[PDB]
């Protein structure tokens, strides 16, 4: 909180997880792949849609 006051500078504070070198909060890790010669500047859209 005390940090959510520096102008442009996301300064979050957080606590280490259970076991450092393992996974994390029961969310997902999701990868968007490019399966034809589609460019960065094309994948980036696809990503932004989703």
């Amino acid at each position: 909180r005390a940090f959510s006051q520096i102008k442009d500078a996301m300064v979050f504070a957080f606590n280490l997880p259970a076991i450092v070198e393992l996974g994390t909060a029961t969310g997902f890790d999701f990868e968007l792949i490019d399966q034809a010669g589609l460019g960065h500047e094309k994948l980036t859209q696809a990503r932004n849609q989703l």
Partner: protein
Amino acid sequence: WGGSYVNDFIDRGRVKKVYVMSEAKYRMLPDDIGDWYVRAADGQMVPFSA
């Protein structure tokens, strides 16, 4: 007469190869070697048969 790869270009997002080489109909018979010249220090166009 035996192609040479030079470096890679990017294709449709993929690193791929670049070969220089002759075209088919300039490397087929032992009498085509006649077509090839080569630059001299003097600047001349000297053919193999010299």
